[PDB]
């Protein structure tokens, strides 16, 4: 049942006497029993990808062959916990080793077997009932926010022979007994699923509901949807991690899976410190955010091979909750670090590289990863509906959107949130380019917007036209010097600045811009566009008369309106609620209309 | 009838990525097929890429995960992947390997065809002539498509190339003075697009004549290497044996080219530009050229393949080699898309080789050729004027340059811009062409003979 | 008498097509006839050489082409000219060759364009901008050349 190590080249270990070993089986390499996964088979020798540092491994060390493939433990005890790249809980390691360093070769259960869970059966099943994969036969109250549905694993079915009555059970007990054809199966609360296999769904559905983001831009102009996939290929300093953290803190998703794959270690600590201090009212009661989130840490200075396991572990967790009828919005803050791991392993493997040193199969891995997102009808008799969204960062070198990872990613993701380093240098955050970005879900959400708002869509269109016209002018104004500009163009240029400085950028570390409820975004946009139309009309109706209302006349006459419009961001929705903000915005609209009547 | 029992081997030498290497094989046949039975009972198939002595390299279509080097059983079929084909494959949806996904039965083998293709004698090839009226002014006016042509649509990621291809499919027809069967090969297509086309075919009532081959982005990436060969093999049966006219759509030759690259790298072949196999040209030619008409038949195959262009360029090896093989392109641009123009087709880098012969008196309109050339030149000049204006300003242009700038703006707004649910005829397209040409005084329309101008221009 | 070979034919025949054509050309040259041989493309021939060079796993040169590409093109292009034929009749024939280099662009760094330019005496370059303006025939008139001026002056 053992092989022996033949050689080590770093993250790749070669082993012999493993004739019966299959690809993508787990092995235990070395006397510390390091976790690895078989990549290649050459006769009776196996090529092993090791997810822990291989320093100190000797030729001749035993290698245990484990029949089970790389898999994830799924059950109660995930939410609120932080995992490493292969689902070993860091709070359980630190509570047992008393160390500050993560030891190598740690064998810790993914989900604690000491906790006595509060379990209630569905009350609809009886002995002799026919149960199929995905069926829910009880609920565990992990906390007050997420009800953890106990599902029959996929590829399992049969008649119910015993169902645990309501009571206190841990993850080592038997909750459901079912039989198929003589063979009997005993299930606990925890199921195991290969991390590289896609969990099956009844039907993949179109995404027709916004994924609310606590941002003005990245929502009004470039919407994301529940179940959609987006990329943020920002250069360093562009603030893409902040966009990801903002979405995690303030969104309309039920579960957030945050994957820190190659991320700075300080970022994962920032989440663990800050999140417990955030609030989200449930039913009149204040509750912490961490009860509805989970996160995976595989930091930059951790084993590079683990970066692949981290990405797949995260999405596998996301699917698990998707199957229970929750809307999941996972975000992996790197992507490029995963592709980087693939390059480093491919090198050690001496594989023939493709574009810029990356493996030829880079596109294959990204395509199969992102396609696991989407709004679905779940398997299981209870007819659940869920989704997984993926918001993945990319780190192109130099900010040049030409690398195989950014290029391949853009061919996969349907929403493009491109960031511009030159906007970040000016602290124009979020640093969204708004010229190269796009969203292919605009048409999908047009029905939603008309149903609930109506006014939003024509405002979205006018805002895009103003920004595009400003760019079209800026190209030539740089060369002319603002000498040949018509009065109608000067208004466009200045309103476009108004939009850029006051609408598209916001300071996410303030009490007022940390979250921007949608009604506020469309409210303040309506006023800015209304100004555009009234100011443009004022000159169009007077340019040919005996006095033309040029910018300098409206600017001096309405200077208080332009300042008030810029102040509209400083509304603090937590201190001043919806009623005051709408009344305030209505007052600015009245002030503008009255000033125009006195002007024209 | 090959009534000879098949050999099954457990003599697996090793597995490396998508490749399984077998040894001790008796008289290996090149491009043979091997059925693999995994230790857990999973069945998969693969095709031999090379043989040498007692060794053979097998390309595994569904994937190699789970294969060991001790128990996996390898059954050699003794033949080349000849695929079952039937005239009643229309109204069916198959996966990337030609198996049912629509809850229907396995296609009944009316006959078998070698998917590698049987070369057609150029002496019997019939030159295409009849124009297809696609409804899209950018195509029917300038870069018209003949029946039997090979005109792929180039695009970059994010552009509406799926909408244009879908529009062509439901609006396809001939210039009149009865319809096409569709063979749709999806290679690396996401689920959102897959349902886009499937739903559009159903809503328009086309499914009676549509055969889908779906290899989705989440399906195996080796399988899609044969997917396009299975699609065209069916098209060839329907067009050349069942006297049907078949329009073949290939959703992305780029995901196909990537699949070839993955295999080429796996066998440590010497690459050419950007890591792709030096033989990419041949692998594409053997698919693209499965088109046209043949003497003695009434059917035809028209191909309109789609190619995503990495990095928005058109020198990437994939579109570069395709351009050398196919008879022009559409080339969907991005600058037109950002301006909310649909279809965002750029007429300058896009040509149709058969256009010069599929138009004119007896096929469309006497002046078709003259209108196309003049409009093209006018657009090209307008772009050069726009390039100057961006530097010298609108105050540094002469009267003639302004005429081309006015043409440029009205050309894209009135001619190119159409909408996805409106079709215009070749005669309506030319009438619009004339409306744009009549912006200029006749003296500036130097690519239209005086006789043509006097007949149409003053109307 | 033409030789027909399409892009979907085997790479070996794609390479040999040029040799077959010129063989027929020399055959009639030796009859005292004036032969004019038109090539469709020499970039497709060079492409065949690149494909085979790769398959044979021999060391490539620029852009994946074999380092001996220039030798193959020179061998073809130098099989031409006005000659005095072998045989008692003292007859004199000729072969003209008109090559055809498909332009990935106007950059003559293209290995095939560059190797051709070093051999051919007359180069009729086709300008992209004149083609865009539908000025036909599209000839640059600035980058083209013909080295037979003094020969024809007589």
């Amino acid at each position: 049942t053992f092989g022996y190590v033949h050689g080590v080249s770093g993250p790749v270990v070669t082993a012999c006497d493993m004739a019966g070993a299959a690809m993508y089986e787990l092995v235990r390499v070395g006397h510390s029993e390091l976790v690895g996964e078989i990549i290649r088979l050459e006769g009776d020798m196996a090529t092993i990808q090791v997810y822990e540092e291989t320093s100190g491994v000797s030729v001749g060390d035993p290698v245990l062959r484990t029949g089970k493939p790389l898999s994830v433990e799924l059950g109660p005890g995930i939410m609120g916990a932080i995992f490493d790249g292969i689902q070993r809980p860091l709070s359980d390691i630190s509570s047992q080793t008393q160390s500050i360093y993560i030891p190598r070769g740690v064998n810790v259960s993914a989900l604690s077997r000491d906790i006595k869970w509060e379990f209630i059966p569905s009350k609809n099943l009886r002995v002799g009932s026919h149960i199929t994969g995905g069926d829910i036969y009880g609920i565990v109250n992990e906390n007050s926010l997420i009800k953890h549905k106990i599902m029959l694993p996929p590829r399992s079915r049969g008649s119910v022979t015993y169902i645990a009555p309501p009571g206190n059970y841990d993850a080592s007990d038997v909750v459901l007994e079912l039989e198929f054809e003589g063979v009997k199966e005993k299930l606990s609360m925890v199921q195991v699923w290969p991390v590289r296999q896609v969990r099956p769904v009844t039907e993949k559905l179109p995404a027709n509901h916004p994924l609310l983001t606590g941002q003005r831009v990245l929502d009004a102009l470039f919407p994301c949807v529940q179940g959609g996939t987006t990329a943020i290929p920002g250069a360093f300093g562009c603030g893409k991690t902040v966009i990801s953290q903002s979405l995690s803190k303030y969104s309309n998703s039920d579960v957030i899976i945050y994957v820190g794959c190659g991320e700075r270690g300080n970022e994962m600590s920032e989440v663990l410190r800050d999140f417990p201090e955030l609030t989200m009212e449930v039913d009149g009661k204040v509750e912490s955010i961490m009860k509805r989130t989970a996160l995976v840490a595989n930091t930059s200075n951790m084993p590079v091979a683990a970066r692949e396991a981290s990405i797949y572990t995260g999405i596998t967790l996301s699917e698990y909750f998707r199957d229970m009828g929750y809307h999941v919005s996972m975000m992996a803050d790197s992507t490029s670090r995963w592709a980087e791991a693939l390059r480093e392993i491919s090198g050690r493997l001496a594989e023939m590289p493709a574009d810029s040193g990356y493996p030829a199969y880079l596109g294959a891995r990204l395509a199969s990863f992102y396609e696991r997102a989407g709004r679905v009808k779940c398997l299981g008799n209870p007819e659940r509906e869920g989704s997984v969204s993926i918001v993945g960062a990319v780190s192109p070198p130099g900010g040049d959107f030409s690398d195989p990872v950014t290029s391949a990613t853009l061919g996969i993701v349907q929403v493009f949130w491109g960031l511009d380093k030159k906007l970040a240098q000016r602290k124009h955050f979020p640093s969204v380019n708004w010229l190269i970005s796009y969203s292919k879900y605009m048409r999908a959400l047009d029905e939603y917007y008309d149903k609930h708002f109506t006014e939003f869509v024509p405002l979205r269109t006018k805002a895009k036209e103003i920004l595009q016209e400003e760019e079209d002018l800026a190209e030539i104004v740089q060369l002319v010097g603002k000498a040949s500009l018509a009065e109608t163009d000067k208004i466009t240029l200045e309103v476009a600045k108004l939009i850029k400085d006051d609408f598209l950028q916001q300071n996410g570390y303030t009490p007022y811009d940390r979250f921007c409820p949608f009604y506020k975004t469309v409210g303040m946009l309506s006023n800015m566009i209304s100004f555009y139309d009234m100011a443009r009309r004022a000159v169009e109706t007077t340019a040919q008369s005996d006095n033309k209302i040029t910018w300098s006349i409206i600017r001096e006459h309405m200077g208080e309106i332009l300042y008030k419009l810029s102040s509209m961001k400083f509304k603090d929705p937590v201190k001043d609620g919806e009623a005051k903000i709408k009344a305030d915005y209505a007052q600015l609209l009245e002030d503008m209309q009255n000033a125009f009547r006195s002007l024209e | 009838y090959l009534s000879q029992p098949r050999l099954t081997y457990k003599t697996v030498s090793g597995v490396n990525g998508p490749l399984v290497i077998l040894d001790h094989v008796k008289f290996p046949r090149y491009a043979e097929i091997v059925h693999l039975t995994l230790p857990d009972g999973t069945k998969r198939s693969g095709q031999v890429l090379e043989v040498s002595g007692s060794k053979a390299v097998v390309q595994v279509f569904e994937g190699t995960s789970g294969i060991d080097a001790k128990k996996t059983s390898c059954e050699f079929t003794g033949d080349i992947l000849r695929t079952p084909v039937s005239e009643d494959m229309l109204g069916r949806v198959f996966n990337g390997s030609g198996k049912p996904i629509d809850r229907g039965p396995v296609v009944l083998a009316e006959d078998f065809l070698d998917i590698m293709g049987q070369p057609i004698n150029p002496q019997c090839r019939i030159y295409p002539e009849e124009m297809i009226q696609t409804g899209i002014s950018a195509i029917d006016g300038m870069n018209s498509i003949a029946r039997g042509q090979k005109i792929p649509i180039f695009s970059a990621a994010g552009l509406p190339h799926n909408e244009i291809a879908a529009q062509i499919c439901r609006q396809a027809g001939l210039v009149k003075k009865e319809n096409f069967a569709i063979v749709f090969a999806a290679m690396g297509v996401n689920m959102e697009t897959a349902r886009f086309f499937k739903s559009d075919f159903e809503e328009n009532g086309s499914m009676d004549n549509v055969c889908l081959f779906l290899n989705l982005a989440n399906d195996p990436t080796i399988e899609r290497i044969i997917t396009p060969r299975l699609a065209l093999t069916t098209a060839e049966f329907l067009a050349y044996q069942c006297e049907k006219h078949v329009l073949v759509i290939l959703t992305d030759m780029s995901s196909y080219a990537e699949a070839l690259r993955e295999v080429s790298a796996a066998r440590e072949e010497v690459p050419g530009r950007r890591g792709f196999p030096g033989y990419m040209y041949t692998d594409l030619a053997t698919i693209y050229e499965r088109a046209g008409r043949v003497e003695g038949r009434n059917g035809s195959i028209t191909q309109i393949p789609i190619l995503t262009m990495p990095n928005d360029d058109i020198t990437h090896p994939i579109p570069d080699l395709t351009g050398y093989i196919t008879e022009g392109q559409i080339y969907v641009d991005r600058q037109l898309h950002n301006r909310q123009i649909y279809p965002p087709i750029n007429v300058l880098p896009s040509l149709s080789r058969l256009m010069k012969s599929a138009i004119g008196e007896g096929m469309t309109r006497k002046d078709h050729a003259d209108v196309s050339n003049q409009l093209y030149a006018c657009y090209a000049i307008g772009k050069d004027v726009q390039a100057m204006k961006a530097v010298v300003g609108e105050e540094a242009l002469t009267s003639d340059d302004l005429l081309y700038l006015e043409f440029l703006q009205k050309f894209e707004k009135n001619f190119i811009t159409q909408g996805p649910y409106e079709n215009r005829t070749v005669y309506e397209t030319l009438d619009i062409g004339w409306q744009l040409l009549r912006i200029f005084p006749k003296e500036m329309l130097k690519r239209i003979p005086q006789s043509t101008l006097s007949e149409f221009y003053p109307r | 008498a033409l030789v027909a070979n399409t892009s979907n034919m085997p790479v070996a025949a794609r390479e040999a097509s040029i040799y077959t054509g010129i063989t027929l050309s020399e055959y009639f040259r030796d009859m005292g006839y004036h032969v004019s041989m038109m090539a469709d493309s020499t970039s497709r021939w060079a492409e065949a050489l690149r494909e085979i060079s790769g398959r044979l796993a021999e060391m490539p040169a620029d852009s994946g082409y074999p380092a001996y590409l220039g030798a193959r093109l020179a061998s073809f292009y130098e099989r031409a000219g006005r000659v005095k034929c072998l045989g008692n009749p003292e007859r004199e024939g000729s072969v003209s060759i008109v090559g055809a280099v498909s332009p990935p662009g106007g950059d003559f760094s293209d290995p095939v364009t560059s190797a051709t330019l070093g051999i051919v005496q007359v180069f009729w370059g086709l300008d992209k901008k004149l083609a865009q303006r539908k000025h036909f025939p599209s000839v640059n008139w600035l980058i083209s050349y013909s080295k037979y001026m003094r020969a024809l002056d007589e």
Binding site: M352, P353, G357 | E268, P271, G275 | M59
Partner: peptide, 19 residues
């Protein structure tokens, strides 16, 4: 260059195995 170097090394390795 990188790919060509590895190709030359792989060819050398293949040749040694054949001897």
């Amino acid at each position: 260059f990188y790919r060509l170097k590895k190709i030359q090394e792989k060819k050398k390795i293949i040749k040694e195995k054949s001897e």
